[PDB]
């Protein structure tokens, strides 16, 4: 259903749902909320699952917020030292600008 909601070009319903299944635990699923979005709040939770400031940085940096991820990372006694490619490079783009719909509701006919 969530998928239907993201298919369609509108934003909330998925988010409450996201709340209500985030709230029902998770280790690989948060992902669903993030892409079609920019911003995620999941990160507040996420760090707790990870909490190695690593995820928090990778995620963090672009809202102009790499920084908190570093603060903890330091506090720990950091453990990061090498990284692989991953520089945001894939397009979270597509959906439905004016003319030629969405489909909340879909019309048809027996004919």
């Amino acid at each position: 259903l969530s998928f239907l909601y993201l298919i369609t070009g509108n934003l909330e319903k998925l988010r409450k749902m996201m709340k209500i299944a985030e709230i029902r635990k998770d280790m690989s699923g948060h992902y669903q909320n993030a892409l079609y979005l920019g911003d995620v709040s999941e990160r507040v939770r996420i760090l707790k699952n990870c909490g190695q400031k690593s995820l928090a940085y990778l995620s963090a940096a672009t809202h102009g917020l790499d920084e908190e991820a570093e603060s903890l990372k330091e506090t720990f006694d950091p453990e990061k030292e090498t990284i692989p490619d991953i520089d945001p490079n894939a397009k979270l783009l597509q959906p439905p600008a004016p003319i030629m719909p969405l489909d909340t509701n879909w019309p048809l006919l027996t004919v």
Binding site: T82, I83, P84, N89, K91, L92, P96, A97, M100, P107
Partner: protein, 239 residues
């Protein structure tokens, strides 16, 4: 004193004693004696000469090694390499978690290739999307027989495949006759497609967009570029 003896011990001996050494907790030293690929390997896990462990791996000769190792590498946060091993493993799932977290297209192409590999429909889609590629998502659907669903995407974010696709879906339906089951129209009648005139296509927004895809949305960030995708987005998008 022992060292003089040491020449005068070989293969297997080294192993036993190595275990003793290991018991001594003279792991490094235990490493020096080290004498079985397994033996070396486990110790290596404990030990973490990372590169060194790789050489022992050499050609690992078991993804299981890589899997085990991957967890370890990741712990050491020796990712550049980890990626190489994991990639070498091509063990997609864990590897995805990293790759995604910083984000990356390149990973995505190779992966796309992978995506094709995996054998359940769903992941591959996220990828296609993730990349931004309706086209890919839709092509994927063609193989799986996702047909109702494919239509929704084709509609929402318009590649107007809704017209193309709908005919085919309908055809299936058609096969399974009954007029209601057949179901029919694209520009006008049942559907009024382009005559409805509403929210998944056009040039101007699109032009702005054309660029948009190219820059980073911005708010304040890192070398790891911007795109956003929230309230603002909705507003311009309408424009």
């Amino acid at each position: 004193m022992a060292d003089k003896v040491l020449p005068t011990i070989p293969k297997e001996q080294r192993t036993r004693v190595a275990h003793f050494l290991e018991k001594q907790g003279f792991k490094q030293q235990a490493l020096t004696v080290s004498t079985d690929p397994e033996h070396r390997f486990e110790l290596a896990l404990q030990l973490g000469e990372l590169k060194i462990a790789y050489q022992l791996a050499v050609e690992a000769e078991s993804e299981q090694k890589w899997k085990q190792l991957a967890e370890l590498a990741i712990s050491k946060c020796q990712f550049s390499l980890a990626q190489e091993c994991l990639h070498h493993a091509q063990d997609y799932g864990g590897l995805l978690l990293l790759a995604t977290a910083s984000g990356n297209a390149s990973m995505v192409n190779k992966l796309a290739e992978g995506a094709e590999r995996d054998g359940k429909n769903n992941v591959a889609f996220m990828s296609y999307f993730l990349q931004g590629k309706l086209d890919a998502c839709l092509e994927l659907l063609i193989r799986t027989g996702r047909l109702p669903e494919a239509a929704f995407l084709a509609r929402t974010y318009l590649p107007s495949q809704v017209s193309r696709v709908v005919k085919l879906w309908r055809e299936n339906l058609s096969k399974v006759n009954q007029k209601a089951a057949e179901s029919l129209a694209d520009p006008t009648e049942y559907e009024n497609l382009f005559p409805g005139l509403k929210e998944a296509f056009v040039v101007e927004e699109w032009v702005k967009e054309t660029h948009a895809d190219l820059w980073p949305a911005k708010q304040y960030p890192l070398v790891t570029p911007n795109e956003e995708r929230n309230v603002m987005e909705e507003a311009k998008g309408f424009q």
